[PDB]
Design a protein around this ligand. Structure first.
Ligand SMILES: CC(C)C[C@H](N)C(=O)O
Length: 344
């Protein structure tokens, strides 16, 4: 008796790279879980939904999953898409485990059916600020963001951290997502003699900013969050991407015990390097542990909050609001060839 589980993310649109990672991880996890007998004999069946990381489409998707009678959701991805959908799932009694939404508010509203297999920006932001203050020590900082929940949330947190540390933040400003011309911004960076920029947002904009800043001869050091640490960023910025600092989850694809999964994904000519491949795979393993205990969403959530689950990300333990305990974002140097190495 097949068990349907919705896998929701940006399958199309400007940030479709995130959905590619998610689906890659989900497909392999389901194949692996089914290969070993499924859940008590029952196989998992993935039902794909595209919310394009758009808040309006996310609501349309959430209502559809409810209508389709699906009780378990692996997603969504972007915070501004995941938040309005979580409202619906919680009211309808649907379990939702997000492998990528990082805005803190999602789990600060008393909801009982939401969990994450990624960290919090209340940790990612401070991690970036601390590194900037202790290791980089720039003279004239600018903080830029795309005016969307994720990016502006991180930008304000970093701003707060730098202010508390008495760093010199010259200006803070936002740009519009989808914009391709950043000549005004780069000119402001040049006029202001900015040596370091923290950008809160996704790869499409970051890529354009990097390529355009370098084209104008800026030697400015840039830093971004996990949303810009992926191959698409390198595709867009090319050479202009080397030297970029990013905060992101550990390289799970490099832990020895995960090699069989890496090989399986490479054999299908898919890319196993993206962080969301692993947070999504771990989300399915978490759901699996829960389903072995009960098919009721509320019972699964209770079980996961009371017991650890060993996954491709190592043992996961959740607190009462559905967040991972002890999760850490690391600081890495990003390279034009799409890889990341531990920062110094
Ligand atoms: C896919 C990820 C870049 C999403 C991001 N962490 C957010 O909360 O919007």
């Amino acid at each position: 008796e097949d068990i349907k589980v919705a896998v929701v993310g940006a399958m199309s649109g400007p940030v479709a790279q995130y959905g590619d990672q998610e689906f890659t991880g989900a497909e392999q996890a389901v194949a692996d879980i089914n290969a070993k007998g499924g859940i008590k004999g029952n196989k998992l069946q993935i039902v794909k939904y595209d919310d394009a990381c758009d808040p309006k489409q996310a609501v349309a998707v959430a209502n559809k999953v409810v209508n389709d009678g699906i009780k378990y959701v692996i997603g969504h991805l972007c915070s501004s898409s995941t938040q309005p959908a979580s409202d619906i799932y919680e009211d309808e009694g649907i379990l939702m485990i997000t492998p990528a939404a990082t805005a803190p508010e999602l789990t600060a509203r008393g909801y009982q059916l939401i969990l994450r297999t990624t960290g919090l920006d209340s940790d990612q932001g401070p991690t970036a600020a601390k590194y900037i203050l202790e290791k980089v020590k720039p003279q004239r900082i600018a903080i830029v963001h795309d005016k969307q929940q994720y990016g502006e949330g991180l930008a304000r947190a970093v701003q707060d951290g730098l202010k508390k540390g008495n760093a010199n933040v010259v200006f803070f400003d936002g740009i519009t997502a989808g914009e391709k011309d950043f000549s005004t911004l780069v000119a402001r960076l040049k006029k202001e003699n900015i040596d370091f920029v923290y950008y809160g947002g996704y790869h499409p904009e970051m890529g354009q900013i990097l390529r355009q800043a370098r084209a104008a001869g800026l030697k400015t050091q840039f830093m971004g969050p996990e949303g810009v640490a992926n191959v698409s960023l390198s595709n867009i910025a090319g050479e202009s991407a080397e030297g970029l600092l990013v905060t992101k989850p550990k390289n799970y694809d490099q832990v020895p015990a995960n090699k069989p999964i890496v090989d399986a994904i490479k054999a299908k000519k898919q890319d196993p390097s993206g962080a969301f491949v692993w947070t999504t795979y771990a989300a399915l393993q978490s759901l699996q542990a829960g389903l072995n205990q009960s098919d009721d969403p509320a019972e699964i959530a209770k079980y996961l909050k009371a017991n650890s689950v060993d996954t491709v990300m190592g043992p996961l333990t959740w607190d009462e609001k559905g967040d991972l305990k002890g999760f850490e974002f690391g600081v890495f140097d990003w390279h034009a060839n799409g890889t990341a190495t531990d920062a110094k």
